[PDB]
Design a protein around this ligand. Structure first.
Ligand SMILES: [Mg+2]
Lengths: 593, 120, 120
């Protein structure tokens, strides 16, 4: 545990020996920055510190500059001083820094540098007699004439330290090549209640104002690290599309109980530039790309368990703290091996419960997961399967005890108007009365009336896609006032529909409008394997799909995602508390890069 | 297990199937009827087993307060999956109650109804 | 006028919106509810002015067989036109009444209902 003394001077070279005795506990490391002023004599300080070999003294001279005279001299000095402060920083503890020496310019610059990068105790040396001879300061110390004053502890910013590795430690350079990232900061600090009181996670008000404005900066493609470290929530994810090709497909195939029952000859056709498609594709090919998985391969119980474990591991790897999965228990049932849909759902429930319990027992980061029983449309398809799915979901919820639970149902598939939501409005009475939750996917290419029926007949609390809501102002009004969440997958819709900067396209992503209007939008992934993009990539691609979006709209999106999840109240409070603490730490440590 | 044990020894055995009774409450937690119906549907979905679920029972207080003109739209669900329904409208009931228990609930079997003589 | 005058003085003012209350008259003419609601859909269309109509109040049922689903034929309009409603299912009402009110009227708010504990 060693403190580093940082000081600078322009005419009073003798402040450093006085500052050395700030605290009687003893000072270890001292370092001084000074320009090329020929007046300065380092010999006096050298012989003063030769009395204490245990203290290591470094003399750093601003090469090519002696005194600030104009703009270029000032900025050159400022850049080299900042580089020296970054270099001499202890990697663990904040330092002790004084600024008595030097004229107002260096003192102010050092103070601003300390306020930026932190200091254990910044202070000022008050010398009444301004001693010049070696003995005089010792006489003052014995008398007590020398006084030391400090304005208080100054934490500075937590994690901006890896800039010393972003900029390599180089001493041979000039002002021709400097980094204007601090001036970029200065510009960003107050460049721009659109974002003032929209702050979610009230713990977000603790970071230094530099952060409180940094979050308002527009999002960029280089934000991958922060997005990955950011805890996220996925609410629309299809399990039947997690593993589709490559290592995941090989692993799930190899864990099958009966290898002979599976085929290893069919593979999905590659799309040039996937996932960033250069040409919009129809829905049929999108489902066909997932033909390698689904029901033709997931019938095997071992395949089921392997797929569930792999999906959970991938979700935990993506820093996701909560998610809801969509699964079709009937689509994987098989009466020949006595594999009913209920058995499949029970297996999935026990697998998720065991995984999360094992993760929690070791006090690691675990992704809480809840189920969604998708009520597949099955245009004719023995339509009693709808009632079968509703009954299965009702009894699965009625099972009750457990930490992993089924929370709602979803209806989707065959989105065309022939299978709209204005048919089964009479069946959903029981599932709603018992206490379940309802989700209705409709709006990708449907009329602006089906959404009204879905929200006001089935009382759906979530709306799949609904990309064309912008042309129905009254639908916007009712959705906003009724607080109905909208789950919507960026990359999947980009691949299917197409938005700027898609070539030969003019349609723009209606996301930014959906946020500023006030719609409870929640970004999701739909089919991870088919789309080939996790939640982190989906968030990152927003900078290209919706230009001008800021790094704080993603926090508001995540807050909306927490709000719109069909979860109990107390679990919501716990999730918000853990999540806001985690976000606070993440943004404290993030911009370091 | 019991019927399998009885049959394996080649002795007379009694095949038996279960009926899920939709107990009448009509006072609180009225979702219990829907819960019972969903449980019965999922139970019959088991498929395997010589002993299975074949029908549901609309028993309880058969008075006018719980006649057959209440939950027919919900019974559409159980009837969709090809499940039999047994009603019970035999004590302190008027002919029209039996009538739309027959024609709205579509009870493939009927319980009691001792006073059927007076309704030709 | 009052709000504008207070705001011009730049002192502390109170924003105020009105909610037209449906008649508390089950007896007498029943066209009163229709004319009240039709007045509301017209009143919302003024647009200009700090003050506004933003919703209706559905008080008027006497906790008897009226419940809140009786008047349901008339309320397909205000929700289609973007208004809001407010139930008053307090007094002495069973959980079923509040349930049907909130799931047919789709009331964004709810009045009283102190005995909500007994219906988890
Ligand atoms: Mg989907």
């Amino acid at each position: 545990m060693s403190r580093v003394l940082l000081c600078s001077a322009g005419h009073s070279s003798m402040v450093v020996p006085e500052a050395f005795h700030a605290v009687p506990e003893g000072f270890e490391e001292v370092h001084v920055f000074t320009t090329d002023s020929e007046k300065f004599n380092p010999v006096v300080l050298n012989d003063f510190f030769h009395s204490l070999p245990n203290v290591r003294f470094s003399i750093t001279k601003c090469h090519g500059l002696a005194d600030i005279l104009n703009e270029r001299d000032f900025e050159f000095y400022q850049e080299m001083l900042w580089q020296w402060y970054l270099t001499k920083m202890p990697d663990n503890e904040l330092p002790y820094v004084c600024l008595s020496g030097g004229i107002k310019s260096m003192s102010a610059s050092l103070q601003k540098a300390a306020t930026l990068f932190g200091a254990q105790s910044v202070f000022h040396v008050l010398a009444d007699n301004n001693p010049r001879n070696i003995e005089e300061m010792f006489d003052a110390l014995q008398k007590g004439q020398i006084h030391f004053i400090e304005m208080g502890y100054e934490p500075g910013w937590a994690a901006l330290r890896r800039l010393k590795k972003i900029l390599p430690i180089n001493e041979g350079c000039s002002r021709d090549n400097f980094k204007p990232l601090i001036s970029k900061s200065i510009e960003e600090i107050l460049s721009n209640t659109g974002k003032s009181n929209q702050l979610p996670f009230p713990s977000l008000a603790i970071l230094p104002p530099i952060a409180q404005q940094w979050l308002q900066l527009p999002l960029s493609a280089n934000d991958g690290a922060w997005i990955q470290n950011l805890p996220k929530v996925d609410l629309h994810c299809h399990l039947g599309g997690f593993a589709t090709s490559g290592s995941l497909l090989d692993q799930v195939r190899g864990a099958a109980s009966e290898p002979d029952l599976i085929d290893r000859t069919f593979s999905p056709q590659e799309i040039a530039g996937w996932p960033r498609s250069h040409k919009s594709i129809s829905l049929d090919k999108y489902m066909e790309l997932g033909n390698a998985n689904g029901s033709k391969l997931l019938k095997d119980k071992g395949c089921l368990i392997r797929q569930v474990e792999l999906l959970y591991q991938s979700l935990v790897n993506d820093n996701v703290a909560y998610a809801e999965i969509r699964c079709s228990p009937n689509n994987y049932a098989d009466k020949n091996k006595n594999r009913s849909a209920w058995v499949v759902l029970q297996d999935i429930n026990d697998t998720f419960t065991r995984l999360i319990t094992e993760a929690k027992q070791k006090n690691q980061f675990y992704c809480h997961v809840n189920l969604l029983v998708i009520a597949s449309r099955k245009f004719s398809g023995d339509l009693s399967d709808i009632s079968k799915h509703l009954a299965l979901a009702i009894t699965a919820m009625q099972q009750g005890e457990g930490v992993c639970r089924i929370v709602g149902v979803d209806l989707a598939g065959f989105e065309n108007k022939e299978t709209r939501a204005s048919y089964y409005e009479h069946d959903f009475k029981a599932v709603h009365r018992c206490g379940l939750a309802v989700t209705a996917h409709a709006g990708e290419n449907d009329d602006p009336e089906g959404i009204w029926q879905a929200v006001y007949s089935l009382h759906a609390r979530r709306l799949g896609h609904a990309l064309n809501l912008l042309e129905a102002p009254d639908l916007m009004r009712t959705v906003i006032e009724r607080k109905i969440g909208v789950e919507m997958c960026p990359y999947a819709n980009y691949q299917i529909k197409g938005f700027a900067p898609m070539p030969n396209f003019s349609a723009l992503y209606p996301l930014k409008k959906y946020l500023e209007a006030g719609i409870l939008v929640s970004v999701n992934t739909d089919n991870i394997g088919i789309s080939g993009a996790n939640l982190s990539e989906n968030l990152l691609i927003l900078a290209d799909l919706c230009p001008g979006i800021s790094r704080m709209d993603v926090l508001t999106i995540i807050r909306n995602s927490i709000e719109t999840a069909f979860i109990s109240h107390d679990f919501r409070m716990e999730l918000l508390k853990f999540f806001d603490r985690k976000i606070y730490d993440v943004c404290l440590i993030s911009i370091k890069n």
